[PDB]
Amino acid sequence: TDRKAIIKNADMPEDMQSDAVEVALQALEKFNIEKDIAAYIKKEFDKKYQPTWHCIVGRNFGSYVTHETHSFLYFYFGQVAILLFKS
């Protein structure tokens, strides 16, 4: 009941966001500091999908970023917010 991930802004084919949440969980298991989580997630997506991707991760922020189509995702799980885009 209390275990829940919520997606609240998305431009993303669905299997790709499932892959994204999986690898985000892997990133949380391996590391603790935000910067290393961001580095891992960006390099992993730059490997499976063509360059270039960008990622910003944290708890309190506001942002305005442009992106090309089907390359955007923003969601909550656990403790920290994830914003992801390709540009």
């Binding site: 209390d2 275990r3 829940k4 991930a5 919520i6 997606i7 609240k8 802004n9 998305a10 431009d11 993303m12 084919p13 669905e14 499932s18 949440v21 999986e22 969980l25 892997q26 949380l28 298991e29 089907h70 969601f75 909550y76 799980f77 656990g78 403790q79």
Partner: protein, 306 residues
């Protein structure tokens, strides 16, 4: 001789297709002609249970128009009659009041049809064939009810792309409850209007993933539920113009293993339901502005089936 016939048909269609066809069942899509006659050969050899539509059709038609004395129009059984002196079109069937009024066979230059008629146009059950040119052989695409020359009924379709469809028809377009089988192997059960998915529908793919949601303008549009079966994870949210942007992500109850897909941690947003609610209000406002007077719940409300 029978074994030779069966073997030559089996190598004609393809051994993989033949083995698949042996694994078929009556819930599947209605087969095309080659598979039909292959299975007729297979059954008449083995005895591996009896239907005839033409018998019922002819049973229905004999009650229609009959011989009348001194009538100045056709109004009866006739042999082949050419509609033009150029001999490009021909018809062979009963008549009523100088127009087509019964069961008859019609031959065009590229099309050929066999069904009932009422006042010059197609009103009944019939089957349609097409050919690319005068040299190419007949290819069958249609089977269903007819009204005023266009498809007002429940029928069969074998699309040119390689798709096969079952469902209602009205105005010659897909309208009603229907089931769609794609060429790649996907299965879609849904409700159709205007030759698009304008209704509630259930979708399932080859890889096992399956869908429950609403559909609009041929794309995924509404509240619905998606399941990732191999990963034992399911997704609930709203779709708008082919892509969803607001949703909650959850694991299936029976998940007990650390392997196929990792577990979601046990913390989340404060009062998340309010935030999601605000989001679908935004989406609904933009939706109404972009497409006013539109209705996704046109004959099946959400409350009837969670």
């Amino acid at each position: 001789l029978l074994l030779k016939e069966l073997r030559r048909q089996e190598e004609l269609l393809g051994a993989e297709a033949v083995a698949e066809l042996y694994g078929s069942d009556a819930n599947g899509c209605p087969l095309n002609e080659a598979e039909e006659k292959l299975l007729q050969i297979y059954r008449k050899l083995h005895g591996f249970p009896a239907v005839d539509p033409e018998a019922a059709i002819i049973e229905r038609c004999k009650t229609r128009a009959q011989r009348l004395h001194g009538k100045v129009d056709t109004h009866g059984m006739r042999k082949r009659i050419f509609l033009t002196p150029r001999k490009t079109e021909s018809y062979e069937g009963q008549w009523e009041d100088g127009k087509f009024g019964g069961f008859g066979e019609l031959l065009k230059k590229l099309s050929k049809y066999r069904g009932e008629f009422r006042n010059g146009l197609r009103e009944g059950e019939g089957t349609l064939w097409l050919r690319k040119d005068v040299k190419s052989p007949w290819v069958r695409v249609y089977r269903g009810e007819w009204l005023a020359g266009k498809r007002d009924g429940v029928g069969i379709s074998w699309e040119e792309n390689g798709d096969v469809y079952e469902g209602g028809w009205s105005g010659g377009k897909r309208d009603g409850f229907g089931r769609l089988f794609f060429a790649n192997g996907d299965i879609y059960k849904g409700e159709f209007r205007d030759d698009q998915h304008y209704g509630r529908g259930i979708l399932r793919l080859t890889s096992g993933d399956w869908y429950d949601g609403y559909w609009a303008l041929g794309l995924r549009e509404g509240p619905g539920l998606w399941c990732y079966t191999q990963k034992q994870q399911y997704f609930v949210g709203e779709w708008s113009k082919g892509i969803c942007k607001c949703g909650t992500m959850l694991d299936m109850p029976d998940k007990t293993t650390n392997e196929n897909s990792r577990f979601i941690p046990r913390l989340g947003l404060l009062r998340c339901d309010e935030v999601l609610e605000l989001e679908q209000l935004k989406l609904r406002d933009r939706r109404a502005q972009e497409y006013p007077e539109m209705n996704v719940e046109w004959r099946t409300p959400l409350v009837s089936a969670p």
